[PDB]
Structures are given as structure tokens and as C-alpha cells.
Design a binder for this molecule. Structure first.
Ligand SMILES: Cc1cn([C@H]2C[C@H](O)[C@@H](COP(=O)(O)OP(=O)(O)O[C@H]3O[C@@H](C)[C@H](O)[C@@H](O)[C@H]3O)O2)c(=O)[nH]c1=O
Ligand SMILES: Cc1cn([C@H]2C[C@H](O)[C@@H](COP(=O)(O)OP(=O)(O)O[C@H]3O[C@@H](C)[C@H](O)[C@@H](O)[C@H]3O)O2)c(=O)[nH]c1=O
Ligand SMILES: [Cl-]
Ligand SMILES: [Mg+2]
Ligand SMILES: [Mg+2]
Ligand SMILES: [Mg+2]
Lengths: 603, 601
């Protein structure tokens, strides 16, 4: 009885990525006999099919099959879905990887809640967030929130196989189709799929490769956009779900070219896509959709229907550079957490303040008179929107690429009158980091982490790395965790845990005049200078001794321990049975990171 | 009568720089028969001496003589000085150039005021200022301010030849001596030299191109020799106190700040012990009274040998700066108006703070360091009104820098949170570009704007910046002016279409374009532009039919006219018969627009 079937369409697959893919599947905690691998090669010109057969020699649950070239992976996925015999289907691309506990966690969550679709937390290489809203916390009954529960609509979820067949849910293999997973996930919800969101564990890694061009030209792009919008209006029968998909895709893909997109494209490309977007808004988008959009997007929709492209270009110049960068006001360790105080304000490129202007009873967007004398009065009136600001912290593992919201933060955003009638938008936030909240695999215990802040307001979303101007290096030894918060070479805030990029002995310093040598016991005690120590810690390492002067001598390897107790830290070096006379260099090697403290001892 | 003798020592001279130097001399407005050239070759292992006398064939007043290699240009200058015969002497290095009106302006200034030394305004390739204090306005009685009037003490001044001989003032002829011109300029002042500061015109260009004093032991042997020279030869209390204070602060205390963070520990311990010994042996205690709080802290910890506290203080001070943002920029009448703001920060991020306790405004320091220092040295209370905030401008081609005058500024110490106080500044100023155009080349040049902020011992002179897009054009009295945010995000003023096309940035009204078949004049009005006064710029345009792929272009004549607060371009079709739609690009001052203009003829 097979629980999970892994559908993998392959075509000229990069071998190293294929080896990583096979590795991540082998590392699954689920028993290998409870799952199966269904590979379907899309007629690879290279030796991809021969390699897939070589992988299948040592794995009896892996089934390989080759088909004619089809151009995309929807047909290979369909053939593999019919060959598959597991309760749940995962559509894994040939250049992605799966986290080691995904199968057991996802199946248990779906089986216990009788889920037809398990939308598990997905990780991407770049960016500070992915599925920030949906991958917040677990939701066994996510379909009760509407079709939004399936966003982001990648095919990298788990689908109950019998549910797909009972409703004839396949991939669009009739022709080349952009966003084929939006059709797929939407069809699932249209047929009443019980959807659950598994957000407490990274299930899938969507890897960026650089080699990742159909639809790049403007005509096939808007041909697929018209095809996707028609599908929404024709297949989605629930009004709330239809209005959501219409609003979400009109805002992101149609109105999404009416802002900064206008400043990085030539005129003849703008005209083709502006006219395409104008006809689509008139023919397919009802007017009530824009009535529940934000002020700035209402302006874009209004001018689009007027054909006022020149005003949208001028607005794009006015809006260029708006952002919110957070500065570290304070950063320190207290007990077993790292504490932060951050501040931010809306600016143009971390420089002069962004302003809104107060006129009588309205807080208005600052616009030229030519543009204001064309828009409805309410479209640039931010008065009723000044209480929707959010200011939150996030974290990203530099190895796993997984991103998380940091819970428990305290933030506040004020609108402050700076000069005359101009108002700036200021934020203050304090939060703490408990690194155990984000360590889910064993590999997470040794990793550098990067801190970011997420600010939203007046339609703007700014998710940037946390930064600081002054030098910042602070260390901690907390319950067997070496921790270093520091300003990296880019001026951003990083947190090394487990000596993955820095040495805690180097960054803490050594009280070199306080080093103790016990000749009879052979112990050398090296107390650390500046470090926050909480709880008991013992990390085994080693040290190397070299005679001073004899620059070519073999290193004398010797046991060493990094100890944290009574709020103090030290490295104990054990000379053991080594007979030593003279002066020696001493270099500690804790967790693979050596120090540069120039330690010399005389024996 | 030879008015000026130009002394030039050469050794393995780069040929293209030697050509630029000679051309710099031939372009002088002074009669060539009133100056002479004295080139002394310090045993060049290249062929520059042969190429020197090549230049002496067509130039009669150029004397060229070779000596054995002395190692640096002290002996070649002394040999050229003796065999020279001019009234004033300029020491011109073989890789520098001199501005065209320098000889005339400097000599007239020295003759009219009987100056022994004319300290002309000097220009360097990099930086936002040079001689910011001394090169303000012209001063024919500069020696009345003290020895300070000769700073910066480069050898690139004009010295009366009679004065140097009547006092045996030469360069040190022995082994290499660092700051050879500080001895020279000091010895000139000690003998009561009539010093004049010519600041209204850039006279000398000290060029940065692609050494003794690199090892720490010889460095501090030279620093010791320099300080002993001041104490032994300077006889006026005010002059000695100045040179001691200035060089103790810049070269001795100057290694006790950020220098500690970009050097290895073994060199730090060498120079620190040298600096501590020199302060104890040569620097009286009262000199430190003339210093600011931060330098008084440095001096105190130096004399205590507390290098570790100095290292900690260096990390705390690392990154303190003041960047100015543009709050407003507009054209009014014949000038460009600016409004900027700044605050002291770390790397233009979080604020720099000072902390209030009782009635004291204190530098924020760790308790371990404050306990080691006298209370007054970290109390800023008496310094809270000593802030300067001024604008500056730099020609990108001439590399000349000027202070922009007429500015209004105001720096405030503001309570931000609890008892923390930040330092905020605001400034208004206008740019009259006529103030900085002195040579014909200065009319077509991009100008870079910067701001100068000082306070609490810190100096921050860096380019002005803006975040939002800024492009504003003006046509003011035959000057095309475009203030803009450059690719680096810094404020630049293009004058004369040196970088940007004014038509492309002004915008063209493609519906008000007129095509007059009677006279054959296509009028292309400009949209967003500022027009003051009357102006007319000659140019040309280019035609090409829309249909043909690579049709030969048809060139014409265009003109950029500014009148009645309006600017327009007039294209003259000439006598060519044309038919159909034609592309049309303009070319005013060598800049073609990208407006994609079509006319149906
Ligand atoms: C090209 C192709 C792919 N496939 C399979 C290979 C994978 O299993 C699956 C998905 O392909 P991937 O390259 O992993 O998808 P991707 O989403 O990572 O790549 C995409 O990024 C866009 C930004 C670029 O325009 C394209 O490179 C596009 O393919 O499709 C076929 O089966 N047949 C084919 O002919
Ligand atoms: C070496 C040498 C130079 N000279 C001349 C050449 C110049 O006219 C003058 C000074 O040399 P310049 O290269 O013009 O120096 P400079 O003052 O322009 O720049 C200096 O900057 C210092 C930071 C470097 O350590 C020096 O090596 C030098 O590059 O001395 C001699 O006459 N004889 C010599 O043997
Ligand atoms: Cl530029
Ligand atoms: Mg992929
Ligand atoms: Mg030189
Ligand atoms: Mg900033």
C-alpha cells in the first residue's frame, strides 16, 4: 500500500540537479516501500533516460518510462499520474529538491484531515518571503477561507490521486500554456477539494538555476493572460472565489505593468501591452473589482480605461524609489534570545523622506496639478488608509533558503507632521529571536541566518534586509549554541549559529593575560572576553600547538572544549601525553573555525 | 625683463604628461618673451632629456641641463633656481599643469602688492576641497594672519627670486626629506615674507597620476626632524603654537583614530610608541588646550599609553558622517536654488546620538572608558553651537572646487528619545554659475554639488544626493543648464550640454510642432523648461525617411531659441525637395535627442 507517488517529468535534465533530487528523495524519513518514484522522460536528446534507468537499478520502487518529446511537462505528468498508484501525488520538477521529513509530515496531515490537496510550505532560492500570507500557520480546513488557500498556485503540492481522477483534473497538454498550475489548482478548488495548509515545515524547495522562453514576446503573453481570465469567468462559479481570482490577477498582471514596468521598457513594447491591457480591462474586468482595490491601484485602473498612458508614465517617475529600510537601533542578547530594536520610515531610496500632504480634512497623495485635475477626488485621499500599516520582522536561512516571520514582535507606525503640512510615515519595532523556532532539520543547527523587515502601507510593500551603520559584533554561548550577530560585508544584519562563517573565540576576544596553565593536570584555560553566556554549554573541539620559530613543524593536535557555565565562557585545552618545552603557538578549533588571537603559551 | 621663471625637475618623465605640461605653458596669456623655462634633468635613465632639448629648439627661452641623479627634486630645483633670472619663480613638477591666465594674474598680483610669496589657489584631482580656509577671498596682506597664510604648504607657489637668494632659502640637498616644502615655506615666512593669497582664480593643477616614508622608523625620524625644526627656527609664539598644534593634530594624533582599524598590530605598536615619545619630548602640555574634545581625548590617552582604549574609541567612531539630501531644487530668475537637510549618522543609516546628564551633553562611551578620562573631555556642552554647514561646487573637467557663498544654514541639537539628542541641519543656497566660469572651457562642463558639515570634531564633505528622480532644465542667457540625479544618485549640473541633451530632458510638444512651407522652417517647441533672458544657440539636425532601412541622412541647420520665457527649436529644411514622413533628430551643442520625432513633408 503506497502512500505517496513522486511524479517527475524529465527532459535534458542537468545531472547534478538530478543527483540532488534523487538524494533528497532517498533522505525521506518515510519507509522507501511506502512511496514510489514515477519518472517519465520527455524524449531527451541527451543521456537523461539512460541515467534515470541507472538510478532505478538500486531502487525497486522507481518506475521509469520514455515518451516522445512534447515541449512541456504537462503531458509527462499526465502519463505518470495514470501509472502512479499512491494515495497522494507530488509533482516534483527535475531540478528541485524535497526536505527529508516532507513525506511523513504531509501524509499524516492529509490523512488525518481527509485532505484532497495539501498545500505545503514552499521555499524559493531568492527573496525574503514566499507565500507570506498563506504559509503563516497550519490550517486543516483551509478551503473554508475560499480559493485563496491554494496560493501560491504552484504544482508543488500534494494532491489525492483518487480525487484528481474522480473529477478529471489533468494538466493542459492541448497546447503550450502559461501558468498551467493556476488552471490545475483552480480546477481542484472548483470541484470542492478539501485543502489543508502545512506551514510549520518546509516541504518543497523551488530552486532557481539561471537557465529558468515561451510567452516572453508581448503577443503570446497577453494571449495567455486573456486565456487565463476567460477560464476564471467561465469555470469559477462561486462569486467570492471569482472576485478574488479576478482581483488578484488583474492587480498583479494587468495593473502590474502600469507602474515601474513603464520605466524599464521601450515605447513600442509599452504600447502593445498597454493596448492589450486596456482591451482586457474593458472586456473582461467588471468595474466593481476596482472598487475594492487600494487607492494607488484605483488610480492605475482609472487612467488605464481613459487610455491616459502619459499620466501613468509620469506617475511611475513620481513613485520610483519609494521604500522602507529598517535600521538597527539596538541589538543585544538577554537570557536565551537575541533582542532587536528597529526603526524605519518611508523614503526615496533610503534618502529623503516620502511625504503625504494634508489639505483641510484630507491626507492626500502629492501629485502634480495636471494629474490631480483628472482623477476622482477620493482616489488620492489616504485619510481612511492611515491605520493599515504593518511592520514585522523576518528571518531567512542562508543554507536552506527558508524564510519565516518572527513572531511576537511589537511595532507601531505613526503619521508625523514634519514641516508645514507635510507628513512622514515612521515605524518603530522591537522583537526577539529564539533560533530554536526555526531549526527543524539537523542541518539547520549550523547555518548563517539573515534578518529582514517587512513594511506595508498605502499600497507599498517593502521587504528589505535589516541594516546598521555602526560596527556590530556580539557573541553568545546559549545552551550549546554558538551565536554571533554581526554587520556583514554588505552592511546587513546576519546571525551565525554553529560557527558556519565566523569564529566565536575570535569575535569574543581572549583575556590573554588571564590564561592559566596547569602543568600537573596538563590543562590550559583560555577565558573568553566579551560574550553573553546563558545556561550550560560544552562543545568538544581541538587545538593545535606549534613551536615558535620552527615554522615548518607539524601541528600538535590536542583536545579542546568550549565551556559555558556561571555566565562565563572559556576554552580548556588538554595537553594530554605530549611532552612540550619552550614557547608554542596555540590555535583553538571550535566547530571547524580557528581563532586569530595570536595565543602563545610557555611550557 | 623676465617676469617669471618656471623651474621644472624631470626624472623618467611620462611623455604624454610632459606634452601636457609644455602645452600648459605655451597657452599662457603672458607674452612668451617675458617668461623662461628652466628644465633640470636628474639623470633620467629614459630619453626624456633628449626629448627636453628637442622642445628647446623651437622655444628660445627654454634652458635644459642634465645633472647626476640626486634621487628627488630638491637639487634640480636648487640648481635651476640659481641659473634662473626671472623676478618670480614657480616650482612646476613634471606631471602637473598650470591654468592659462595664471602667469598674468599672479605676476600682476605680486607686483602690485610687492609680495615675496604669491600663494595661488591650487587644484587637486580628487576631493571636494583644497585650501578651504585659506583660499576664500584674495588677501594681499596674508602674512598678517601668521604662518597659517601659507597653508597648504605645497611648493607650487610663486616666490620672488631675489627673496630666496637674499635669505639662502633652498630645499634640503642631502637625503630624502618628507614635506620638503614645509621647511621651504616655513623658512620663507620666518624671514618675514610678504605673502599674498590669490584665491579668485585657480592657478595650479596638482595632478594625481599612477616611496620614502613608507616604513615606520623613517617616517617618525622625519616627523621628529620636522617638529624640532619648528621649535628651533620659529620665533613668534603664535606661529610656533599654530604649526605645533596643526602638525600634532594631523600627523601625530592622526594615527589614533580610524588609522588604528586599517593597520596590523605590529606596525600600530611601533608608531604608537613613536607618537607617545614625540608627544612627551616635543609637544608642550598647553598645545592640547587648543584642540577639540575628541583630540583632547586622543592626546590624553596617548600620553597615558592607553592604546587599547584608543582602539575601542576608533571602533565606536567608525562611520560617523553627514550626508545631505535634496529637499527642493528649482530655477528662479538667473540662478538655481537648493534646499538641503542633513543629520549626523553612521553610514547614512541610524542617527548619531549624544546623551544628556544633569547639564552635561556627553559623548556616548562605555563606562570603562569614561572612567579613564577627565570629565570635561567628553562633555560637548560648550561646543553645541560650533557647527558649520556650507555648500560647494566642483568642475568635473577643471577639478576646481569652490565654496558656494550666500547660503543660509542652521544646525540644531534635537532631543529625539529619552535623553538622547541628534544633530540635524538645514540649508538654503543658490548657484550663480557665472561665479565659477573663468576660462572658456568652463562654459561647457558638468558641475558636481557637495556639502560641507563640521561639528563635535567631525568633518563630512561629500556629494549632495537625492532619492527621487530629479531632472530640471533651464535656458538662461545662452546657457543650457540641466540639474539632475546622475547614475550614482548624486546631484550634477550639466552646463552647455556636456552630458545630456537639453531637448531630450525638456520634453517636446509633438502637437504644437509647426511646419511652414513658405520659409521652410520647422518649429519644435520645448515643454518643461525654464527660460530667463534671451538666448540663441546654433546647431544642426538630421533627416531620414521612415520607409527606407538605411537611407543616407539629410543634414540641415537647427537653432535653439529662448525668448519670452519660452524655448523652441527651429529646423531649416534648405533647398532639398522632400516628400513623406521623415525622422528628425536635433543636435544642439553636440547632443542628439531621443524624442522619436516624425514630420510629414
Ligand atoms: C522544456 C521541458 C521541460 N519539461 C519538464 C522539466 C521539469 O520537470 C518541468 C519544469 O521545468 P523547469 O525548467 O524545472 O521549470 P521552471 O519553472 O524552473 O523554469 C521556468 O522558468 C521560467 C522563468 C523560464 O522562462 C523557463 O526556463 C521555465 O521553464 O518540465 C518537460 O517535461 N519537457 C520539456 O520540453
Ligand atoms: C624621483 C625624482 C623626482 N624628481 C622630480 C619629479 C617631480 O618634478 C618632483 C616630485 O615627483 P612627483 O612624482 O611629481 O611627486 P608628487 O608630489 O606629484 O607625488 C608624490 O606622491 C607621494 C605620495 C609619492 O610617495 C611620491 O612618490 C610621489 O608620487 O621631483 C626629480 O627631479 N628627481 C628624482 O630623482
Ligand atoms: Cl553625470
Ligand atoms: Mg525548475
Ligand atoms: Mg607630480
Ligand atoms: Mg539614509
Amino acid at each position: 500500500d503506497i502512500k505517496i507517488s513522486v511524479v517527475v517529468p524529465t527532459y535534458n535534465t542537468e545531472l547534478e540537479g538530478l543527483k540532488n533530487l534523487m538524494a533528497s528523495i532517498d533522505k525521506q524519513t518515510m519507509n522507501p516501500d511506502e512511496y514510489e518514484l514515477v519518472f517519465v522522460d520527455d524524449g531527451s536528446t541527451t543521456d537523461t533516460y539512460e541515467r534515470l534507468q541507472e538510478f532505478a537499478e538500486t531502487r525497486p520502487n522507481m518506475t521509469v518510462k520514455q515518451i516522445e518529446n512534447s515541449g512541456w511537462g504537462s503531458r509527462p505528468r499526465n502519463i505518470a499520474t495514470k501509472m502512479a498508484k499512491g494515495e497522494y501525488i507530488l509533482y516534483l520538477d527535475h531540478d528541485d529538491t524535497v526536505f527529508p521529513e516532507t513525506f511523513e509530515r504531509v501524509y499524516n496531515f492529509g490523512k488525518e484531515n481527509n485532505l484532497d490537496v495539501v498545500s505545503g510550505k514552499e521555499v524559493r532560492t531568492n527573496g525574503w518571503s514566499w507565500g507570506w500570507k498563506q504559509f503563516s500557520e497550519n490550517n486543516p480546513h483551509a478551503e473554508e477561507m475560499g480559493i485563496e488557500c491554494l496560493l501560491p498556485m504552484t504544482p508543488h503540492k500534494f494532491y489525492k490521486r483518487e480525487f484528481l481522477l474522480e473529477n478529471d483534473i489533468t494538466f493542459d497538454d492541448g497546447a503550450r500554456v502559461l501558468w498551467e498550475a493556476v488552471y490545475f489548482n483552480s480546477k481542484a478548488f472548483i470541484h470542492g477539494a478539501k485543502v489543508g495548509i502545512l506551514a510549520d515545515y518546509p516541504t518543497y524547495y523551488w530552486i532557481a538555476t539561471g537557465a529558468n522562453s515561451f510567452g516572453r514576446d508581448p503577443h503570446e503573453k497577453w494571449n495567455q493572460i486573456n486565456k487565463l481570465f476567460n477560464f476564471f469567468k467561465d469555470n469559477i462559479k462561486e462569486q467570492r472565489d471569482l472576485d478574488f481570482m479576478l482581483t488578484h490577477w488583474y492587480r498583479s498582471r494587468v495593473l502590474g505593468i502600469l507602474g515601474q514596468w513603464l520605466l524599464k521598457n521601450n515605447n513600442e513594447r509599452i504600447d502593445i501591452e498597454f493596448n492589450y491591457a486596456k482591451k482586457l480591462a474593458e472586456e473582461l474586468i467588471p468595474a466593481y473589482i476596482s472598487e475594492n482595490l487600494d487607492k494607488n491601484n484605483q488610480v492605475k485602473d482609472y487612467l488605464l480605461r481613459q487610455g491616459d498612458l502619459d499620466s501613468l508614465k509620469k506617475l511611475a517617475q513620481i513613485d520610483a524609489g519609494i521604500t522602507a529600510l529598517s535600521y538597527v537601533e539596538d541589538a543585544y542578547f538577554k537570557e536565551d534570545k537575541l533582542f532587536f530594536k528597529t526603526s524605519t520610515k518611508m523614503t526615496y531610496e533610503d534618502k529623503e523622506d516620502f511625504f503625504i500632504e494634508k489639505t483641510a480634512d484630507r491626507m492626500e497623495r502629492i501629485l502634480p496639478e495636471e494629474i490631480k485635475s483628472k482623477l476622482p477626488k477620493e482616489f488620492f485621499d489616504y485619510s481612511d488608509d492611515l491605520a493599515e500599516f504593518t511592520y514585522e520582522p523576518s528571518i531567512k536561512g542562508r543554507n536552506s533558503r527558508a524564510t519565516w516571520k518572527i513572531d511576537g514582535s511589537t511595532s507601531n507606525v505613526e503619521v508625523v507632521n514634519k514641516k508645514a503640512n507635510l507628513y512622514k510615515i515612521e515605524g518603530e519595532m522591537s522583537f526577539s529571536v529564539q533560533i530554536n523556532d526555526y531549526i527543524l532539520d539537523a542541518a539547520d543547527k549550523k547555518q548563517p541566518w539573515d534578518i529582514a523587515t517587512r513594511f506595508t502601507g498605502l499600497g507599498y510593500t517593502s521587504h528589505r534586509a535589516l541594516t546598521i551603520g555602526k560596527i556590530l559584533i556580539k557573541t553568545a554561548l546559549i545552551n550549546n549554541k554558538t551565536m554571533i550577530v554581526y554587520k556583514n560585508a554588505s552592511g546587513l544584519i546576519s546571525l551565525d549559529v554553529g560557527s558556519s562563517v565566523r569564529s566565536i573565540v575570535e569575535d569574543s576576544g581572549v583575556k590573554r593575560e588571564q590564561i592559566l596553565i596547569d602543568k600537573t593536570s596538563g590543562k590550559v584555560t583560555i577565558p573568553l572576553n566579551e560574550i553573553h553566556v546563558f545556561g550550560e554549554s560544552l562543545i568538544e573541539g581541538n587545538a593545535e600547538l606549534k613551536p615558535v620559530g620552527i615554522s615548518d613543524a607539524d601541528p600538535i593536535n590536542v583536545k579542546a572544549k568550549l565551556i559555558g557555565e556561571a555566565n562565563k565562557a572559556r576554552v580548556e585545552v588538554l595537553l594530554g601525553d605530549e611532552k612540550l618545552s619552550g614557547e608554542y603557538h596555540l590555535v583553538t578549533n571550535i566547530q571547524g573555525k580557528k581563532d586569530k588571537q595570536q595565543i602563545k603559551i610557555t611550557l
